[PDB]
Amino acid sequence: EEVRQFRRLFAQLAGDDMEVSATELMNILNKVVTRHPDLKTDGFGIDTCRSMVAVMDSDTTGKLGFEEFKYLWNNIKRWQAIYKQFDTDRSGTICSSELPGAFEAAGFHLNEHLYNMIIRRYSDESGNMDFDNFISCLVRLDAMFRAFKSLDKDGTGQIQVNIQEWLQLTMYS
Amino acid sequence: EEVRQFRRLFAQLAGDDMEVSATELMNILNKVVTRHPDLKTDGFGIDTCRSMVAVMDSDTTGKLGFEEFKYLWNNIKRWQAIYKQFDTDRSGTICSSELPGAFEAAGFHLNEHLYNMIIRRYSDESGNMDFDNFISCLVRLDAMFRAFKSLDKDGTGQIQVNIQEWLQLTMYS
Numbered sequence: 001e002e003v004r005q006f007r008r009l010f011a012q013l014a015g016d017d018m019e020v021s022a023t024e025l026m027n028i029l030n031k032v033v034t035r036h037p038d039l040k041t042d043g044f045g046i047d048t049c050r051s052m053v054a055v056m057d058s059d060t061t062g063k064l065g066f067e068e069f070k071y072l073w074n075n076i077k078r079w080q081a082i083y084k085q086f087d088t089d090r091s092g093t094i095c096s097s098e099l100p101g102a103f104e105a106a107g108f109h110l111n112e113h114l115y116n117m118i119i120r121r122y123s124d125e126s127g128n129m130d131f132d133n134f135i136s137c138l139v140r141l142d143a144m145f146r147a148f149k150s151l152d153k154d155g156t157g158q159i160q161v162n163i164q165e166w167l168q169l170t171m172y173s
Numbered sequence: 174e175e176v177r178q179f180r181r182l183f184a185q186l187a188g189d190d191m192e193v194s195a196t197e198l199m200n201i202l203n204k205v206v207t208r209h210p211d212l213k214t215d216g217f218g219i220d221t222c223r224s225m226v227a228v229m230d231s232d233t234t235g236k237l238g239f240e241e242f243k244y245l246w247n248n249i250k251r252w253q254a255i256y257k258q259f260d261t262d263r264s265g266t267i268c269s270s271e272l273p274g275a276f277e278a279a280g281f282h283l284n285e286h287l288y289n290m291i292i293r294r295y296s297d298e299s300g301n302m303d304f305d306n307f308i309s310c311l312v313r314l315d316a317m318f319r320a321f322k323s324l325d326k327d328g329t330g331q332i333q334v335n336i337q338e339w340l341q342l343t344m345y346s
């Protein structure tokens with residue numbers, strides 16, 4: 001019902017090795033955005049998709065199995081509706097004054113310093129963020145929240161990170 | 174003398190805001206790699222160049238000033254010299270067997286598991302890594318080392334961070 005649609009999409013998408021590569025992901029996402037003329041993008045490029053796959057490849061197989069891919073695709077789905085909803089001037093892009101509302105709608109309450117930092121790294125010189133840049137930021141933000149949580153065993157708001165962990169979390173990303 | 178010349182390079186490249194943007198960087202890099210046929214590459218792409226700038230933009234102007242650019246540029250020439258040198262089979266790309274030597278000569282000593290991750294994130298399906306991916310890997314690796322060391326002056330092998338700090342460190346990259 002729910003997951004018969006989805007079980008099929010995953011099987012067709014993952015193909016012969018039954019996992020979703022960076023390329024397979026790239027291609028489906030560009031296919032989907034083709035159908036939404038209200039999402040401005042210059043396309044999901046390969047290195048952005050390798051980075052989304054790495055940050056979601058928890059068992060480190062190199063590729064996304066069914067659960068990893070399901071988690072990603074349902075997020076992307078929720079986040080696309082948010083992008084459209086908070087693009088309140090229909091630029092096809094999310095600008096600096098739209099960005100807070102959008103992020104907090106996805107459950108990320110950042111502060112001004114952090115918002116500005118995000119815009120500096122993900123938005124263009126006018127301070128606009130296109131759809132691929134938006135999704136790829138969110139995937140990462142979501143992963144880095146969840147890696148913090150996983151490390152904050154005692155719920156102190158402070159984590160201790162050893163150099164091995166640091167290098168794995170930042171490089172396989 | 175080559176300090177005269179390099180200031181001229183910088184000035185011409187940075188133009189009228191006297192800083193190097195990710196676009197300006199992307200262009201000089203692709204321009205420079207065409208002179209070097211032995212460096213195989215599918216191009217430096219805008220996302221990787223935003224990432225490289227962010228990683229290098231210590232003073233957070235969003236762009237690369239003179240010292241920031243020079244630092245990046247000197248690493249890149251050291252590393253391309255290392256790339257050419259460790260490509261023993263002259264393939265114009267760095268394979269899995271050639272890789273440890275090259276990272277060793279850039280002075281990184283990582284365990285097997287970290288190598289495997291890096292190869293899955295940056296190399297192709299035959300374990301082959303091309304020049305833009307190599308350079309992008311090393312810029313990032315170097316910066317993640319320096320960020321960590323900066324916060325672990327005393328060599329405990331651990332840093333302690335809150336969520337704001339963590340997000341600054343892992344997203345402005």
Ligand SMILES: O=C(O)C(=S)Cc1c[nH]c2ccc(Br)cc12
Pocket residue numbers: 032033073076077080
């Ligand atoms: O816009 C809609 O009504 C839907 S059902 C979109 C949608 C549903 N699943 C999706 C996955 C990726 C992207 Br981009 C968009 C979608």
Ligand SMILES: O=C(O)C(=S)Cc1c[nH]c2ccc(Br)cc12
Pocket residue numbers: 205206209246249250253
């Ligand atoms: O500039 C040169 O004549 C050489 S031999 C190397 C070099 C000097 N600066 C460089 C910057 C990027 C790359 Br790729 C190579 C170089």
Ligand SMILES: [Ca+2]
Pocket residue numbers: 013014015016017018019020021024
């Ligand atoms: Ca596949």
Ligand SMILES: [Ca+2]
Pocket residue numbers: 056057058059060061062063064065068
């Ligand atoms: Ca996996």
Ligand SMILES: [Ca+2]
Pocket residue numbers: 086087088089090091092093094095098
């Ligand atoms: Ca807008």
Ligand SMILES: [Ca+2]
Pocket residue numbers: 041042043130131132133
């Ligand atoms: Ca984009």
Ligand SMILES: [Ca+2]
Pocket residue numbers: 186187188189190191192193194197
């Ligand atoms: Ca400039």
Ligand SMILES: [Ca+2]
Pocket residue numbers: 230231232233234235236237238241
């Ligand atoms: Ca700067």
Ligand SMILES: [Ca+2]
Pocket residue numbers: 259260261262263264265266267268271
């Ligand atoms: Ca080679």
Ligand SMILES: [Ca+2]
Pocket residue numbers: 214215216303304305306
């Ligand atoms: Ca490449």
